């Protein structure tokens, strides 16, 4: 558990070739950017990757 | 590259047993929480983990 303040442009790399920047700065909603490859076991919100990663993939398709 | 708005309590898992919540909500500075194990190749800001992960030296509180 590591809690580090952020609001500009972070850059962490967990796995073996990733890159996740937690922008932090934004109007009302903060646009968080998560850059990660589909090689390592990566799980996220269905809708999230459903609109960014894969255009409507769902469980089985 | 996946850009998803966030400001409440996210939860992504990249690797094989992690958990990073990009709080988003906060006063002036946004306290971002990155929960990740020291098993997979994870690299971050020296100072960051130096104060959270491994006690680089010491702190006054």
UniProtKB/Swiss-Prot annotation, chains A, B:
InterPro entries tied to this protein: CsrA, CsrA_sf
Outcome (variant: residue 40 to A): 90% loss of in vivo repression and activation, 67-fold decreased affinity for RNA, about 75% wild-type protein levels
Region (Region 2, important for regulation and mRNA-binding): 40-47
One cellular component (GO) term of this entry: cytosol
A molecular-function term among this protein's GO annotations: mRNA 5'-UTR binding
Effect of residue 2 to A: Loss of in vivo repression and activation, 73-fold decreased affinity for RNA, about 75% wild-type protein levels
UniProt effect for mutating residue 7 to A: 70% loss of in vivo repression and activation, 12-fold decreased affinity for RNA, about 125% wild-type protein levels
Effect caused by changing residue 42 to A: Loss of in vivo repression and activation, 135-fold decreased affinity for RNA, about 40% wild-type protein levels
Principal localisation: cytoplasm
SUPFAM superfamilies in the cross-refs: CsrA-like
Similarity comment text for this entry: Belongs to the CsrA/RsmA family.
Subunit description: Homodimer; the beta-strands of each monomer intercalate to form a hydrophobic core while the alpha-helices form wings that extend away from the core.
Further information: Identified as a multicopy suppressor of the slow growth phenotype of an rsgA (yjeQ) deletion mutant.
Function: A key translational regulator that binds mRNA to regulate translation initiation and/or mRNA stability, initially identified for its effects on central carbon metabolism. Mediates global changes in gene expression, shifting from rapid growth to stress survival by linking envelope stress, the stringent response and the catabolite repression systems. Binds to the 5'-UTR of mRNA to repress or activate translation; 2 binding sites on the homodimer can bridge 2 sites within target RNA. Exerts reciprocal effects on enzymes of gluconeogenesis and glycogen biosynthesis versus those of glycolysis. Binds to and is sequestered by non-coding small RNAs (sRNA) CsrB and CsrC which antagonize the activity of CsrA. The consensus RNA-binding site is CAGGA(U/A/C)G which is located in probable hairpin loops. There are 18 sites in CsrB, which cooperatively binds about 18 copies of CsrA. CsrC has 9 sites, and cooperatively binds multiple copies of CsrA. Indirectly activates expression of CsrB and CsrC, both dependently and independently of the BarA-UvrY two-component system.
Xref: HAMAP family: CsrA
Domain notes: Two regions important for regulation and RNA-binding are found in the N-terminus (residues 2-7) and middle (residues 40-47). Both are part of the intercalated beta-strands that form the hydrophobic core of the protein; region 1 from one monomer contacts region 2 of the other. The homodimer has 2 distinct RNA-binding regions on opposite, solvent-exposed surface of the protein.
Name of the protein in question: Carbon storage regulator
Organism encoding this protein: Escherichia coli (strain K12)
């Amino acid at each position: 558990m590591l809690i580090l303040t952020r609001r500009v442009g972070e850059t962490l790399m967990i796995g073996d070739e990733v890159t996740v920047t937690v922008l932090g700065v934004k109007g009302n909603q903060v646009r968080i950017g998560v850059n990660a490859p589909k090689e390592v076991s990566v799980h996220r919100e269905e809708i999230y990757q459903r609109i960014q990663a894969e255009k409507s993939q769902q469980s089985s398709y």
